[PDB]
Design a protein around this ligand. Structure first.
Ligand code: FAD
Ligand code: FAD
Ligand code: UQ2
Ligand code: UQ2
Lengths: 463, 463
């Protein structure tokens, strides 16, 4: 019950799902004069995910790396409306999306209507076109105990939980005598994932220990131990072998214990069971004690996308994400589009792919809105003549702790970069500053870093 | 049970209670080479209380106006030890202090001993001399319902509660239609207290409304209403009448409803009952609806100080604080000293009084530690010949919202200042920056303000 249908305006309604890289990038490029745009997302702000790993340890403040949606919508010319709630069910036949847990409603540049909605009231939102960018969720691979004792590294709350756990453990450990094995376990951290997120997480945690903790509790600092576990035989496999090797050496020089060729079998309250697969082809078992477990491995489709597979006939055989055209239209649907991690197009699940797809699609919509036929929809994309999406891989970046990073930079064919260590660390900072989406967030992180040069990190457990 | 008694060292032990203005100021001046210093306080950091009223609304970040104790202790030459716990009982006869709720132990410049203490374990701490600076706690004057529905404005947690309440109310109000009286109550704020803390609190809240809220929800911003209630007939009575008048005019120009000659009789869930005492000597009743109640009135002795009145014979007739000498020694005690709000010496309860008493006392201790007799204690203060404490009133300051402040600056006899409006607002900033106790906190607030010039306040309900 309750159906919101704003269409006194003669414009078509483009409904967006999410407030991440795909949704915001699309929002920034979509012509709000041609269409009435509306966003649905339980998250009232945009997260700059590449700096998330610096948040727990206080290299950057959590407020520094987020930006309210309304600030993006405010710079838009036309009307934009944000429903603070999550999409539960996508309804192709009805052309609606069901919502749950209404926390707020914002209607920018729309001084007129009144919805008449109580909080947590179920509803249905009409649409003419739908862009789906809810993203994925973390994958535990069905390995028991991960959700009970692990911390994912996906969202701002996760940064606060990791700080609270680790601060708690440091306080406890400090009361026990230098020998105690419990002291040793409480000071043990385990990051699962050999990719960029995991490496950066181990790097930042190590930075905090060597730089901040050592200055007022050197005793505790010496006994802390950080493990990095990865199933593949090479860390950061998306780079050339030469850069991966340097990466692995450096991590071990900064005293991080790297566990390659290693899968996790089970996760318990105080330890995890791992199977390591050696060069001679033999498998061994080892226990890894821990006090804080960061889970930074791959992705899995969300319940809303899974529920959509059952409804569209040709979307049956789909698991990783939604099956999509060369034009980023959802296969089998008349008007549903998909971008980012929640959409399969044989491309990686990365922020670079989300942004470029978002722009492409936004560009097309602004082109599509200059025709009588768009004012049935599938054949019109071709007749008028315009190009499909061509991803342009720009490369990869990764901070490795202790003022060192690796970089590969390119455009299509040619490659040009500086990807060693300290100088690449400086390039790394500049580029990241450059690709932050807002000026406020950019000044905030700049100040965080200036402050970090002179005074070192804030690491409060209650804040 | 369990008694910690560190005295392998030949030095006397000066035990400090608290981590506020008196304790930290004393700590910075006490010679750690002459004495073994130890702090007991449940709060692991120092709070810069004059900027606390800018925290809720995000003019300054909560992290910006606090500084961990260990940073102060680290700059000290000798040994310093901090017990993260609260003093429960002061024991003159035994010369000990009982403690509760052990969260942590820090022993800076002391790479040796091990206490062997579990968390939340009761204990007793030996001492030779004791400096008491626990401060006071808020006084509700026995007016019912204050602690049930009000927010005190005393500590960092209070800043977070006020933001959470107010953000919640704004979100709710926004869903109701422009008429609704509930909408009007949810947008109503009430600050109790005509002194500086209360005035500043009303000013900051009004700044947030006019500057930030109006830019994205002008409709809500116009209907917000802020009340200031004060029992005395004049706001900010500690200034000359001429400055108080300007203060009151300005507050009313910025659309704040000031209620003078008004006492609060009772506080309910959605309103408060007040009695106003008019010029013709008649008393009236009025209800003041509200959604957020900030209680910023006076002080009251803490249970630890009250419990000490019963034990010392001549400390019986004492209520506001501990009765104290011209040398700041506790009357009736051999070795207990009191500074700040928890000590009565016919002086105001202000930060300026705490700092000067702290220095005086610290100075004396460093002088007292160059004699055979100090190596019984009461008569030695006089025989060697040195002066009593003479407070030097430097004046008063107060921000009044909308870039205006009042100032009175002086030293003893002479008075010299600039105490009008906008120019006094600039002086106000400089002086406050100048009397922050640490460089980190000083840069942090400076950056907050630079950021505030270009981008306006962060006002997140979860952060
Ligand atoms: C810690 C970390 C670091 C990373 N670092 C990098 C990096 O350095 N470089 C790089 O290229 N890539 C990086 N990535 C990858 C990148 O963040 C993702 O690939 C990208 O966010 C995917 O874009 P998206 O819009 O599909 O999903 P997201 O950006 O995750 O956004 C999804 C949005 O949908 C919302 N949502 C969730 N569920 C629902 C629902 N049911 N209904 C409605 N809305 C919903 C969420 O609130 C969120 O705002 C990183 C990822 C992580 C976790
Ligand atoms: C919002 C606000 C604004 C203010 N502005 C000004 C101003 O502009 N100018 C001015 O001069 N004054 C101002 N004051 C007054 C000033 O903060 C106090 O007068 C001052 O704090 C008193 O110093 P103190 O050390 O006695 O107590 P505090 O500074 O309050 O410190 C008390 C310390 O004792 C600790 N403690 C409490 N109970 C126990 C216990 N049982 N055991 C151990 N430790 C304990 C606390 O954690 C705290 O660290 C302001 C106060 C407030 C609340
Ligand atoms: C998760 O692994 C990573 C990628 O994918 C496997 C990347 O591609 C890049 C390259 C950096 C990007 C794309 C920053 C985002 C830029 C914009 C314009 C949004 C990094 C650093 C990375 O760590
Ligand atoms: C509680 O009312 C207040 C006073 O007392 C009646 C003051 O005197 C001042 C003046 C500012 C001070 C004293 C800052 C404190 C500085 C140090 C070094 C402790 C302010 C602002 C004030 O609000």
């Amino acid at each position: 019950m309750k159906v919101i249908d704003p269409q006194h305006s003669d414009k078509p309604n483009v409904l967006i799902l999410g407030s991440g890289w795909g949704a915001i990038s699309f929002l920034k490029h979509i012509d709000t004069k041609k269409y009435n745009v509306s966003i649905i997302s339980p998250r009232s702000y945009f997260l700059f995910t590449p700096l998330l790993p610096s948040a727990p340890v206080g290299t950057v403040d959590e407020k520094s790396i987020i930006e309210p949606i309304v600030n993006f919508a405010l710079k838009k010319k036309g009307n934009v409306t944000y429903y603070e709630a999550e999409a539960t069910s996508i309804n192709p036949d009805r052309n609606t999306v069901t919502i749950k847990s209404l926390s707020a409603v914002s209607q920018l540049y729309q001084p007129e209507n009144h919805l008449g909605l109580h909080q947590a009231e179920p509803a249905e939102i009409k649409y003419d076109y739908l862009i789906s960018a809810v993203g994925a969720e973390p994958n535990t691979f069905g390995i028991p105990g991960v959700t009970d004792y692990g911390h994912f590294l996906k969202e701002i709350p996760n940064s606060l939980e990791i700080r609270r756990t680790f601060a708690a453990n440091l306080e406890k450990a400090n009361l026990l005598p230098k020998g105690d094995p419990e002291r040793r376990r409480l000071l043990s951290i385990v990051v699962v994932g050999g990719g960029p997120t995991g490496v950066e997480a181990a790097g930042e945690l190590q930075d905090y220990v060597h730089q901040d903790l050592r200055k007022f509790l050197p005793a505790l600092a010496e006994e802390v131990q950080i493990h990095l576990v990865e199933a593949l035989p090479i860390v950061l496999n998306m780079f050339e072998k030469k850069l991966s090797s340097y990466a692995q050496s450096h991590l071990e020089n900064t005293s991080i214990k790297v566990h390659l060729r290693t899968a996790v079998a089970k996760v318990e309250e105080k330890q995890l069971l791992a199977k390591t697969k050696h060069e001679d082809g033999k498998i061994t078992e080892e226990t890894i004690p821990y006090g804080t477990l960061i889970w930074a491995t791959g992705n899995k489709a969300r319940p809303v996308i899974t529920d959509l597979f059952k409804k569209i006939p040709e979307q049956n055989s789909s698991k990783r994400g939604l099956a999509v055209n060369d034009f980023l239209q959802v296969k089998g649907s008349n008007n549903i589009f998909a971008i980012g991690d929640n959409a399969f197009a044989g491309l990686p699940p990365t922020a670079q792919v989300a942004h470029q797809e978002a722009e492409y699609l936004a560009k097309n919509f602004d082109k599509m809105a200059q025709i009588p036929n768009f004012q049935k929809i599938d054949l019109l994309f071709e007749e008028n003549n315009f190009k499909p999406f061509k991803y342009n891989d720009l490369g990869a970046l990764a901070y490795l702790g202790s003022e060192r990073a690796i970089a590969t930079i390119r455009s299509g064919k040619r490659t040009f970069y500086t990807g060693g260590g300290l100088m690449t660390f400086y390039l790394w900072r500049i580029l990241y500053l450059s690709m932050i989406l807002s000026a406020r967030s950019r000044l905030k992180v700049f100040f965080d870093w200036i402050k970090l040069a002179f005074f070192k990190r804030d690491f409060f457990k209650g804040l």
